[PDB]
Design a protein around this ligand. Structure first.
Ligand SMILES: *[Se]c1ccccc1C(=O)Nc1ccccc1
Ligand SMILES: [N+]
Ligand SMILES: [N+]
Length: 351
């Protein structure tokens, strides 16, 4: 007769076993009659046996720097076979935790990139990218690009089509992200693209025009950066929205006590760059809005229009600035992703 054969997904005596996959045992020419797995302290590991008795797998994630011992017995008409296997899992030098935006279940605008931010510098960007699975429906091509040593972004060539579902699975637990840095955990988030909302601030008219699904719905007189502190041209992604916010220049790098510093409370403020540009209520400049530029870079509008903007724009909507005397918003600003040409974005910078 034929003696049962056992096949494990680990080898006895292995070291550095990664914990990004379950551990399995398979029987052939027989069935699994006993399968147990314990850690170094004797703590059992939860598992599940298939109804046909041929396949057993762990059902909870295994830990770092552990020693596991697997005992399996297979029985068949032709005899019995028993094996004992002991293996050692990865021993990270450090862990890093990923943080994903936008939030799970959110509806966002057509400019919203997927963002994965780690709390440590990532030595092996390629490994991180390979560990992140992005599903889109309808499917569209996209690509990864790193804004700095810790945050990676994914987006398509053109703005998203409304109604697209986007699923983000960051499967970094057990993955070596370089230099002994392993993922602290997995994260899973899902979001959806809503209406197309694109607002254009044209320096030639000093008007901020809001288009919803292609139709002009609001035309807002604005005052942008004066010549000495101009507003940069380019594509801005709407970020966070505030009924009011204490605008403190030191958050954007400039001491309040410096000549260009400031600390003032502002109403109805919508963030459009990490450098600190907002659409906001500006009662002090209503006389100049629609005529001349008087601000330090923000888009000043009236209180009523700033509240309208707050109420009708969402994270990931788009503000485009054109014809100013400024330069172009940096692509790595944090909300300036779309100013990177697609060929450069697509090629990436994983190194
Ligand atoms: Se931008 C902005 C938006 C609302 C209120 C104030 C500002 C601002 O930057 N003010 C400022 C900049 C530099 C020096 C003084 C004041
Ligand atoms: N983001
Ligand atoms: N992907």
């Amino acid at each position: 007769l034929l003696v049962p054969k056992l096949t494990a997904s680990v080898t006895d005596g292995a070291v550095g076993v990664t914990v990004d996959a379950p551990v399995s045992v398979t029987a052939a020419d027989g069935v699994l009659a006993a399968v147990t797995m314990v850690n170094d302290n004797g703590r059992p590991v939860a598992g599940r046996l298939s109804p046909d008795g041929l396949r057993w797998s762990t059902t909870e994630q295994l830990g770092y720097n552990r020693r596991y011992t697997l005992n399996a017995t297979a029985l068949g008409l032709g005899g019995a076979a028993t094996r004992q296997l002991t293996f050692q899992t990865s021993s990270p030098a450090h862990l890093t935790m990923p943080y994903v935006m936008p939030g799970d279940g959110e509806v966002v605008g057509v400019g919203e990139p997927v963002a994965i931010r780690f709390d440590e510098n990532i030595a092996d960007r390629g490994a991180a990218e390979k560990a992140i699975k992005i599903t889109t429906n309808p499917p569209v091509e996209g690509a990864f690009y790193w804004l700095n040593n810790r945050e990676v972004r994914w987006r398509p060539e053109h703005f998203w089509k409304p109604g697209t579902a986007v699923d983000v699975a960051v499967n970094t637990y057990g993955v070596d992200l370089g230099e002994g840095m392993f993922g602290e955990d997995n994260v899973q988030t899902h979001f959806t693209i809503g209406d197309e909302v694109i607002a254009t601030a044209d320096d030639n008219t000093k008007i901020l025009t809001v288009r919803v699904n292609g139709e002009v719905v609001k035309s807002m007189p604005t005052s942008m950066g004066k010549d000495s502190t101009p507003t940069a041209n380019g594509i801005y992604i709407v970020g966070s929205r505030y009924k009011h916010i204490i605008m403190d220049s030191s958050t954007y790098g400039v001491p309040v006590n410096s000549p260009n510093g400031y600390r003032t409370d502002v109403d109805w403020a919508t963030q459009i760059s990490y450098s600190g540009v907002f659409v906001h209520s500006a009662p002090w400049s209503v006389g100049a809005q629609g005529h001349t530029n008087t601000s330090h870079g923000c888009l000043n509008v009236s209180p009523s229009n700033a509240q309208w903007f707050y109420d009708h724009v969402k994270r990931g909507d788009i503000v485009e600035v054109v014809n100013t005397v400024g330069g172009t918003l940096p692509g790595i600003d944090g909300l300036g992703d779309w100013n990177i040409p697609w060929d450069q974005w697509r090629a990436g910078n994983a190194k």
